[PDB]
Design a protein around this ligand. Structure first.
Ligand code: SF4
Ligand code: SF4
Lengths: 349, 351
């Protein structure tokens, strides 16, 4: 249903971002990075919950000294989060880091940003351009007066086309608007002018329930419009909750999922079976399937197949039988023992 | 920034829905209707949490005789949910109920529906047209094959224009989709083809956090596209939480709120003051303001005022002073005792 934004594909370690690739779920470590064992324990929990790339803060000397061990033992690509010293970007990259994220706007002189980018090109490390009100250049503040959506977007564009000029192509940008509406607009202006992958999220979303709502609204809207190649929910909470939240939002729009998802039809006046009965049977035999598949349990046979185009696999149920279908095309007719064969086909998938 | 859909105004009791009106927060009661004490106690709790219209389910005969007492002392306009028997619709309207909701596609034959509608015009009671896959007619089901977004939308349009034919205007519609994406598309198709008020919400959102997330996505999208004149969040949780969720969704897009909202600037390289300090001062002095205003505490002076156009009121702070502003216009320069004058203006905003 969503018309995805065309985007060039990039790479952070083993993970594809943009274009053809699924939208990636990201998170940030909340532990002190210099504490190797605590951070790796949190990364492992993040991996367990489906976090695909992890961002690691590196504010001090001791965090740089921890980075090598973290990358070697991380089941995930690691992004080094840099803020003030261009040298930390260089030192982080030498430590084996798969990605750096910088605010090119205040990291230093433009010519130093070029060197960071040229070093990243030599080591095959991805870059994230972060742009926000605090990184907005003096020249654009004068043009717009204040950090407007357009001011933030033009900044992102400006840097993006500098990266292209410098011959560097392996980057994604991130635009943090002050609220949901400014965040949407700022990214929307950028999205429509370029094919550069986008990191999306709401920075200071809030606490617990309220933060979760604001995140769902913000990320959901962008996602709806086919915008976002990577996602992070930013909650002042356990980073696993942040990962779980991101997956629920994506699941809402049928873009990603964790484990098996069993969906029943609406239903309608075409219904041919007792759907609640077969659904219950499906839930029981498919309990303990750890494969990100949308499974469709449909009330009729013929029209159900068209209806469940986007489902990976499902059963189009008739009075004494069902049709097993796969990616919108029917495979075979099976008796009221269609479920074991549906399970059999998923183990084969 | 929000492109609000042009809608005609309707009335449910004394509450205005659509057109010029703010988006109405609605909720359904969870207790049995025939229990009169439990329902009115929950209604009071919902009103205190900001709920503007209450929906009351009526599946049996005892629940109908309960309605009379409920509508007399309820602070909210009450709406009866007519499910199985269309007989309940006539009986509910005689009880003095402000609104009804029916699924006319399966509530019976068209003749009876027409009489339900004509009785609603004489009493002055609003009708909500409920359309979902289950209420879809054999006619359209054969046109589209299955209950697609455009199948759902056409049914809503068809019933809408049948109400027009009967000379009835005081109605709104809701369209339930299979998932968020279908719900959005079906409501979008309807929204562009008519000026009829829409009730929006996700019916089977889920339990707890999962339900909250799914609702926020579904409602957030439609709200962003300027669609929805009344909202209900549907959770298996407490109805009060639904109201709390609805207000937070609307708050994130700056459409509705409960109580004061104090917002600081981003900030940026123009910053003229220690903002966290002045923000904490505002939080302290403004604690005790119940009016749903948006108060902006900005880091600089000149360019801050334009930045905070949409805010009801705020301070644009400099070294030893600040500009007090409302809706993007400067009003008076105040010394670093800029705060007592800000509250003094908000007190005066209320009178
Ligand atoms: S699968 Fe068949 S019975 Fe179920 S909603 Fe679709 S058309 Fe109706
Ligand atoms: S109010 Fe001033 S300091 Fe604050 S974000 Fe706007 S321009 Fe920057």
């Amino acid at each position: 249903m969503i018309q995805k934004r065309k985007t060039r594909q990039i790479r952070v370690g083993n993970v594809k971002i943009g274009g053809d690739a699924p939208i990636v779920v990201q998170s940030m470590t909340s532990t002190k990075t210099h504490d190797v064992e605590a951070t790796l324990n949190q990364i492992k929990r993040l991996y367990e919950a489906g976090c695909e790339i992890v961002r690691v803060a590196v504010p001090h000397k001791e965090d740089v000294e921890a980075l090598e061990e973290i990358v070697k033992k991380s089941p995930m690509p690691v992004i080094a989060d840099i803020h003030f010293a261009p040298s930390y970007a260089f030192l982080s990259m030498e430590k084996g880091v798969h990605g750096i994220r910088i605010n090119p706007g205040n990291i230093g002189k433009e010519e130093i940003v070029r060197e960071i980018v040229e070093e990243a090109k030599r080591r095959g490390v991805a870059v994230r351009i972060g742009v926000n009100s605090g990184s907005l250049e003096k020249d654009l503040l004068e043009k717009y007066g204040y950090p407007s959506a357009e001011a933030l977007a033009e900044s992102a564009l400006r840097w993006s086309e500098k990266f292209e000029k410098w011959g560097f192509t392996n980057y994604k940008v991130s635009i943090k608007g002050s609220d949901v509406l400014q965040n949407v607009r700022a990214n929307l202006i950028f999205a429509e002018r370029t094919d550069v992958p986008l990191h999306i999220g709401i920075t200071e979303a809030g606490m617990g329930t309220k933060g979760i709502i604001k995140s769902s609204v913000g990320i959901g809207i962008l996602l709806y419009m086919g915008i976002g190649d990577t996602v992070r929910v930013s909650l002042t909470d356990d980073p696993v909750v942040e990962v779980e939240t991101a997956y629920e939002i994506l699941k809402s729009l049928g873009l990603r999922r964790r484990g098996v998802e069993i969906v029943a039809c609406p239903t309608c006046g075409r219904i041919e079976v007792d759907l609640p009965k077969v659904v219950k049977e499906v839930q029981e035999k498919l309990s303990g399937v750890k494969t990100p598949l949308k499974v469709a349990v449909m009330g009729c046979v013929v029209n159900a197949i068209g209806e469940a185009r986007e489902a990976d696999i499902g059963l189009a149920c008739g009075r004494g039988f069902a049709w097993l279908f796969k990616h919108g095309k029917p495979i075979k007719k099976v008796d009221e023992s269609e479920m074991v064969d549906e399970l059999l086909k998923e183990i084969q998938n």
